Amino acid sequence: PMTLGYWNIRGLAHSIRLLLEYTDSSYEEKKYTMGDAPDYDRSQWLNEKFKLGLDFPNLPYLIDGTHKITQSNAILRYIARKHNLCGESEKEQIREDILENQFMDSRMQLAKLCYDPDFEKLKPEYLQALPEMLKLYSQFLGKQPWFLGDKITFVDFIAYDVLERNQVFEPSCLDAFPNLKDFISRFEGLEKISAYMKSSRFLPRPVFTKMAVFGNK
Amino acid sequence: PMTLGYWNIRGLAHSIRLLLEYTDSSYEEKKYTMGDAPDYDRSQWLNEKFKLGLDFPNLPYLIDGTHKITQSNAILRYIARKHNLCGESEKEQIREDILENQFMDSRMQLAKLCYDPDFEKLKPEYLQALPEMLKLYSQFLGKQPWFLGDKITFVDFIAYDVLERNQVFEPSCLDAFPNLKDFISRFEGLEKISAYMKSSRFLPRPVFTKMAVFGNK
């Protein structure tokens, strides 16, 4: 089985866990915990960061035999490649490349107003930019069931993670774009996705923990 | 010819300009200027941001006929794909994916201590992390002429941009890793790269301009 390492938190490993579940990949999780109290002891990770054989140690990581991969996007692409979950035509590849990078940008904007102390100040402004962000994704998705067209590919797992995270942030924003809301619902309704979400394995630690004021769980 | 749009600054378009030059691609540049004084008027871009037909308007952008691409990594991959500048085996693809994402992370750390007001405070700390960052890249490159092996691919253009930018930041750091220094020199010595760097087209606006204290040019 493969070993997926990440913090005992949702964060960047969410889309990966979902893809592993979807592809029925055999895997085990190495979870690292952070210091509960104000002294966020990250020593559980720091103690073995340079002892895993990773070229560029980081979380999350994926160990698959001789293959040891870091960088969330590289991990998703690695698994996707093994299961026909990639764009095929030049048009689809251009699209997945733009989307992969665009979603990371959106994720970072939210991550910013999460691991921040004065969240109260910036929230109302992020909410002002959110409609534009969502509108562009809605425009793009259009009438397609998935981001690249009629078939599910790795970018849909990233898309689901960031769109769903905003749904929890402020659900009325997704309501304005039923296109996106239905996408979220269509993804969650996938046979293996539902199974996992009902299983006791699903819930690790919702949102960005106490370390990040947004979703201190 | 293709149209490359970006600010009249080095920034994210550097690796792209270099790749276009390397591949002898016919192209023209649409440059946007920012407000010189403390009122950084970005209106030249803002005025046509939503009138270019870009799905996710942003800078830089590349218009190639019916193809309009945003996100720097997607742009590089687009051009590279047309010129055999991609990893071929599964091993090379895994490597380019990790590197592409790793270099972006390194770039962001530097960009951070650039568009910052109190640069004076953080510089000495960034310098403390720099050796670890460089060491990992040196370890990886090893004895290969290029990051993926014996042939040049798109990740080398990204690699050059971030490693060279650090060379200018604090050159003695690169001195500690002759592996990286020679790479920088081998890249600059490429026939079409040298030509461009001697030409009057090279110098746009070095570093992150007055907007970013690091390289106010």
- Burial of B24 (C-beta count, 10 Å sphere; 0-12/13-18/19+): exposed
Q: The tokens 């750390």 sit on which residue?
A: B109
Rounded CA-CA distance A206/A60 in Å is 16
How many CB atoms neighbour CB B5 within 10 A? Answer: 21
A:B CB pairs within 8 Å: 64
Q: What angle, rounded to 10 degrees, do the helices at A90-112 and A154-169 form?
A: 30
Residues 6+ apart with CB under 8 A from B125: none
Best B2, B75, B97 member to test A by mutation, with max A CBs in 10 Å, is B97
Q: Testing the interface with A: which of B54, B83, B94, B106 to mutate, by most A Cβ within 10 A? A: B94
Distance from C-alpha of A103 to C-alpha of A133, rounded to nearest angstrom: 10
Element at B30 (helix H, strand E): strand B27-32
Long-range contacts of B149-152 (CB under 8 A, 24+ apart): B149/B92, B152/B85, B152/B190
Closest by Cα among B82, B71, B96, B73 to B25: B82
Token code pair at residue B158: 């990204």
Q: From CA B116, how far away is CA B212, in angstroms rounded?
A: 6
| Helix%, strand%, coil% for chain B, nearest 5 | 50, 10, 40
CA dihedral A197, A161, A6, A65 (to 10 degrees): 80
Breaks in chain A (C to N over 2.5 Å), named by the residue before each, are none
CA distance A168 to B103: 31
**Is beta strand B27-32 parallel, antiparallel or unpaired with respect to B61-64?**
unpaired
Cα–Cα distance between B130 and A205 in angstroms, integer?
Answer: 32
**Do A91 and A31 meet the contact criterion of CB atoms below 8 Å apart?**
no
Between β-strands B27-32 and B2-7, what pairing exists: parallel, antiparallel or unpaired? parallel
Q: Is B141 helix (H, G, I), strand (E, B) or coil?
A: helix
- Could you say which residues from 49 to 68 on chain B have a Cβ atom under 8 Å away from some Cβ of chain A? 55-56, 67
Distance CA A70, CA A63 (A): 9
For chain B, domains (ranges, CATH) are 1-85+191-217 (3.40.30.10), 86-190 (1.20.1050.10)
In one-letter notation, the amino acid at residue A200 is S
Query: What distance lies between CA A4 and its chain's CA centroid?
Result: 14
Kindly state the helix (H) or strand (E) to which residue B6 belongs, with its residue range: strand B2-7
CA pair distance B206, B216, nearest whole angstrom: 8
Contact flag B74-A98 (C-beta cutoff 8 Å): yes
Determine contact, residues B113/B122, Cβ cutoff 8 Å. yes
| d(C-alpha A157, C-alpha A15), whole Å | 5
CA distance A68 to chain B (A): 10
Burial class (CB in 10 A: 0-12, 13-18, 19+), B84: exposed
Under DSSP, the state recorded for A13 is G
Element (H, E) at B4: strand B2-7
3-state secondary structure of B146: strand
Nearest-CA neighbor of A147 among A192, A105, A109, A102? A102
The backbone torsions φ and ψ at residue A172, rounded to the nearest 5 degrees and listed phi first, read -60, -20
B154 Cα to chain A: minimum distance (Å): 14
Is B115 flagged in the annotation as binding? Answer: yes
| Axis crossing angle, helix A72-82 with helix A14-22, rounded to the nearest 10 | 10
| Nearest neighbour of A97 by CB, restricted to B55, B71, B139 | B71
A 10 A CB-CB count for A130 gives 19
CA B82 to chain centre: 19
Beta carbons of B74 and A97 less than 8 Å apart: yes
B199 in a known ligand binding site: no
- CA nearest to A6, candidates A160, A204, A210: A204
Identity of residue B134: L
Tokens of A186: 């269509």
